[PDB]
Amino acid sequence: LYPVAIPEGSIEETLTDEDLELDTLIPDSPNQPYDMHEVITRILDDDEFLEVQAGYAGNIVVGFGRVEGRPVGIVANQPTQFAGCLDINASEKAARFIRTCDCFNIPIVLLVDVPGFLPGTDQEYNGIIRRGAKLLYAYGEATVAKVTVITRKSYGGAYCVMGSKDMGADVVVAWPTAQIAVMGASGAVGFVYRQQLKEAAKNGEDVDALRLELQQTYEDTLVNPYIAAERGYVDAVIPPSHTRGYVANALRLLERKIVQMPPKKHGNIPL
């Protein structure tokens, strides 16, 4: 640890201008990317980030930084590459980075904007199930402090993988732009209202307009952080500028953890 003088006052009193720049980072359009390094460098001390495997599987960013002098490992989805989907390579990258941090007692901070897994027969044939389960295993096994910040999307199985509460995330916070759902509204509506869309297709109604209206309703009702917050999968929904303060305060709280686990010789991680 480095010595750092902690600023006195609440998280809301200690906001800097660099913190306030997070409030406008997320584009209004759901399909506009942003560079996740803009978040990483603002939550880390001195903007100093040591990226690891920067040239590999750039859809996920991993590396070291300090929060109030404490070394932390970052694992963050990268919207500018493959829309931030998880894939085989990003899974194996993040999985071994997490296991190394956990071996050496380094806390992990996850920054989440993941739409799902990268679709494709090549991913299926090269073993996305088996090799993606490595990241689940690494995160579930890890007993360091685990903090999740959700910025925008956390859908489906990728929600589970990227630091869900029941996978043992110690603290989960979401930005107001977070979108936590089983699947995108287009797919969900095409399923939940299949009977109505086919009935409209019988009647010759404007099935496209109906589908778009149902999708708008589903997005406005469910594709947000608040259902998860209502069930306590998200511990707080916070203004983005609060993120640095929340992370530093949670890491201070979690600096000592005891987790009971069944006795084993060693585990049996997917290989």
Binding site: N105, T143, R256, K257, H266
Partner: protein
Amino acid sequence: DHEAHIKVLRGEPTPEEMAALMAVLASAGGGPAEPVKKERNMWGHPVDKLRYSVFSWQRVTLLERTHMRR
């Protein structure tokens, strides 16, 4: 008298230069001397997280010593 003093090894300041110097050095002092308020809290200490063989000698020389050393 066996304290190590500040020595002006070269140069001969006037009283006002000595006063300015000592005031600056004292302002540059390291703050409170040591963190005497530091308290023992062994909760979740890393040595408790390790797997030890049931017959491991590190149970004596690592685990036990870390808990017992004061």
